[PDB]
Amino acid sequence: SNIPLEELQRNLQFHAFISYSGHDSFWVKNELLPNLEKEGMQICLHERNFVPGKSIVENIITCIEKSYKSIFVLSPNFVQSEWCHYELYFAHHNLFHEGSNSLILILLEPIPQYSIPSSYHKLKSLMARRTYLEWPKEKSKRGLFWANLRAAINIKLTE
């Protein structure tokens, strides 16, 4: 029982775009994607829905524009291999307005401060909010994680 995309104002094709580092593919493909897709959600996926003949940036932007929410799978891997795309793009476009709930942050793995370049200002800003969902190491708290996550996807967008 998720959001019916057709009932929305914009012409959206996906409930969520999932941005992740290829190094985190096992958890994304065996945990994140099944729990969202077995619920009936439509997911725009890094490299799975990307179109040939376009740059990776254009493919990412296309997923974002066609998705109700965007999910970043934060981790040291994501910082090192994926975040630069967004730091560069956010420097010229207010794609996600500070205060809007269109962007969902999953802290899959804690990110040490030394691994964050000083020039990743937008990343430090987003994580200073402390509004991300932490993947719990304790198995008994993973039901809470999935419930929180599905709620973050289905919550009404900030006006």
Author numbering: 624 to 782
Quote the study's own text.
We undertook several attempts to crystallize the TLR1-TIR/Zn complex. Similar to TLR1-TIR without Zn, crystals appeared in several months in P6422 and P6222 space groups, where the last one gave better diffraction. The best crystal diffracted to 1.9 Å and was used for the structure solution. All the crystals that were obtained provided the electron density with the Zn2+ ions absent and all cysteine residues in the oxidized state, similar to the structure of TLR1-TIR without Zn. We assume that the disulfide crosslinked conformation of TLR1-TIR is the only state of the protein capable of crystallization. In our hands, the protein was as well crystallized with the disulfide bonds, being formed in the presence of TCEP agent, whereas no disulfide bonds were observed in several weeks after the sample preparation for the soluble fraction of TLR1-TIR in solution under the similar conditions. It is noteworthy that crystal growth was essentially slow and took several months, and all the reducing agents have a limited lifetime. Thus, it is most likely that the protein crystallization started at a time point when no active TCEP was present in all the buffers, allowing the formation of cysteine bridges inevitably observed in crystallographic structures and necessary for the crystal packing.
